[PDB]
């Protein structure tokens, strides 16, 4: 009975940590493809703010 | 092109289908068509090597004037080149002064592109044009018709 | 290239 | 043997699925952090396109 409710906290839990990981998962493609785009978007920043700070030069 | 092509001129057929399968799964978790930080990343650190999205994009500007915006496959492989040890800097600048002053047939400091296509007409081998007026617009930056040697040496990079 | 490679690598 | 078999390999799936999360859960706060920076990179690179912007007029 204790091993089955293992069974079933091992289980849940790697179905808990299954959601989480896929979670964090996306979390981290999400955060990564972003972060890329986050980072393009520092480089049209900085792109932009090179365009106009050229012009201000 | 004119450094990529010359390249892969060399490197046999196997060496193509080994790097055209590693962008088949450097695109394992792809990006942009491209390939942007992630497989980029990817790849390094299931070594460890260090490409950034800032200088990743800005190699690819250097770069994506085909059109790739990011690390295509041809990105990928261009970091690929741009880390094994062949050869680099420049035959000497007392060579390169004695070049240009060969293209300076005229004995002066200024070349304007027809000695200079003399000289290539001296190299002989199949001449290209266009890339001939490339590498005025290289070298005269100065851009007034007629060339230096400084202007010569942004006329000849990559150059034995 | 050996450490991830191996043996495969011959020619390319 | 099965009840704890099935909680000891459901608590390995879920080690490494929990390191997964732990990987996914580090790369998703170090690219959230990086999304953070690139994207507070963009809004000072912005904040700069404004001054610069605005020092242009």
């Given at each position: 009975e204790?091993?089955?409710?293992?069974?079933?906290?091992?289980?849940?839990?790697?179905?808990?940590?299954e959601?989480?990981?896929q979670?964090?998962?996306?979390?981290?493609?999400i955060?990564?493809?972003?972060?890329?785009?986050?980072?393009?978007?520092?480089?049209?920043?900085?792109?932009?703010?090179?365009?106009v700070?050229?012009?201000?030069? | 092109?004119?450094?990529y092509?010359?390249?892969?001129?060399?490197?046999?057929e196997?060496?193509?289908?080994?790097?055209?399968?590693?962008?088949?799964?450097?695109v394992?978790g792809?990006?942009?068509?491209?390939?942007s930080?992630?497989?980029?990343?990817?790849?390094?650190?299931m070594?460890?090597?260090?490409?950034?999205?800032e200088?990743?994009?800005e190699?690819?500007?250097?770069?994506?004037?085909?059109?790739?915006?990011?690390?295509?496959?041809?990105?990928?492989?261009?970091?690929?080149?741009?880390?094994?040890?062949?050869?680099?800097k420049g035959?000497?600048?007392?060579?390169?002064?004695?070049?240009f002053?060969?293209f300076?047939?005229?004995?002066?400091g200024?070349?304007?592109?027809?000695?200079?296509?003399?000289?290539?007409?001296?190299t002989?081998?199949?001449?290209?044009?266009?890339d001939?007026?490339?590498?005025?617009?290289?070298?005269?930056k100065?851009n007034?018709?007629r060339?230096?040697?400084?202007?010569?040496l942004?006329?000849?990079?990559?150059?034995? | 290239?050996?450490?991830?490679?191996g043996?495969?690598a011959?020619?390319?």
């Open positions: 204790e091993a089955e409710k293992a069974a079933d906290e091992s289980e849940r839990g790697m179905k808990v940590i959601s989480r990981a979670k964090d998962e996306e979390k981290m493609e955060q990564e493809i972003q972060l890329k785009e986050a980072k393009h978007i520092a480089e049209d920043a900085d792109r932009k703010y090179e365009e700070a050229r012009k201000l030069v | 092109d004119d450094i092509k010359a390249a892969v001129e060399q490197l046999t196997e060496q193509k289908n080994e790097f055209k399968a590693a962008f088949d799964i450097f394992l792809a990006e942009d068509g491209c390939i930080t992630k497989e980029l990343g990817k790849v390094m650190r070594l460890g090597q260090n490409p950034t999205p200088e990743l994009q190699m690819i500007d250097e770069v994506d004037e085909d059109g790739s915006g990011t690390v295509d496959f041809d990105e990928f492989l261009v970091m690929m080149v741009r880390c094994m040890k062949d050869d680099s035959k000497s600048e007392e060579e390169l002064s004695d070049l002053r060969m300076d047939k005229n004995a002066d200024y070349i304007d592109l027809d000695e200079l296509k003399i000289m290539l007409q001296a002989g081998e199949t001449i290209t044009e266009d001939i007026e490339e590498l005025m617009k290289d070298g005269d100065n007034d018709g060339i230096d040697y400084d202007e010569f942004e006329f000849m990079k990559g150059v034995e | 290239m050996q450490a991830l490679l043996a495969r011959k020619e390319s």
